[PDB]
Amino acid sequence: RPTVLCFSGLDPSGGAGLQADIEAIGQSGAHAAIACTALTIQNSQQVFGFEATSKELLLAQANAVVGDLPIKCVKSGMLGTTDNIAALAEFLRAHPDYQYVLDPVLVANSGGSLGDQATLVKAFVELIPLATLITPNTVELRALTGVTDLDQATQKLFEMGAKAVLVKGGHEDTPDFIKNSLYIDGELAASSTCPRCSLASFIAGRLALGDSLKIAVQHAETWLFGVL
Numbered sequence: 001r002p003t004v005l006c007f008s009g010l011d012p013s014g015g016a017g018l019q020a021d022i023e024a025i026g027q028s029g030a031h032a033a034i035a036c037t038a039l040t041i042q043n044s045q046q047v048f049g050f051e052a053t054s055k056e057l058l059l060a061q062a063n064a065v066v067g068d069l070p071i072k073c074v075k076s077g078m079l080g081t082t083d084n085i086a087a088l089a090e091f092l093r094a095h096p097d098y099q100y101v102l103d104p105v106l107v108a109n110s111g112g113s114l115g116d117q118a119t120l121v122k123a124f125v126e127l128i129p130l131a132t133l134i135t136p137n138t139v140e141l142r143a144l145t146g147v148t149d150l151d152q153a154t155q156k157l158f159e160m161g162a163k164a165v166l167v168k169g170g171h172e173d174t175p176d177f178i179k180n181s182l183y184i185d186g187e188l189a190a191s192s193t194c195p196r197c198s199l200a201s202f203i204a205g206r207l208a209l210g211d212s213l214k215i216a217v218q219h220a221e222t223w224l225f226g227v228l
């Protein structure tokens with residue numbers, strides 16, 4: 001059972017964060033390991049605050065997993081601080097053989113703060129070229145690039161060094177479905193939907209199990225359509 005190591009925050013209410021990573025990775029067929037980036041204080045309605053994990057304790061968790069478990073993929077969600085973004089980049093550069101799924105979490109779904117967005121956007125520059133796949137929703141895509149046109153923003157992310165981008169949402173969305181577009185090396189590789197879209201951890205698990213990107217993304221949609 002290949003392992004996905006998740007650099008993710010803890011949401012006590014269990015709606016998001018490393019709990020959702022654990023659930024998705026288990027359903028993908030892989031094993032989840034966790035390097036907790038923050039203990040948040042939040043529920044479905046608001047974020048009250050959070051205590052970011054120090055860079056030292058973050059790397060200590062990650063390094064405890066290294067050597068014990070067969071890490072094949074890293075996934076990141078909430079990182080909280082620019083220190084933790086830098087620590088993850090340091091970790092990834094020490095392990096270029098790991099695949100990496102970057103979910104560029106800038107805000108909570110409730111709207112509450114999971115860190116200062118402007119400085120997080122600037123710090124994410126370092127992680128963009130390291131990712132096997134970046135999974136921005138349309139808000140995250142625009143924030144990372146400073147570009148409001150989705151097509152132009154996607155291309156800008158590739159100019160910034162992205163290798164593959166799964167854009168969640170776009171001009172093809174409807175009340176029943178969010179449309180996802182998988183781009184590889186700047187070119188549209190697969191155009192799909194998703195009934196509703198938190199795909200990064202499930203995709204990471206499928207990548208850990210040896211799937212190609214296209215097959216992993218397809219499995220993730222089948223998983224969500226199976227919930228429906």
Ligand SMILES: Cc1ncc(COP(=O)(O)O)c(C=O)c1O
Pocket residue numbers: 008009010011015016017018020021040042077078105107108109110114198199
């Ligand atoms: C701690 C935390 N991580 C991540 C997310 C969103 O990413 P997922 O719910 O896919 O982990 C949220 C909420 O939006 C969150 O509060």
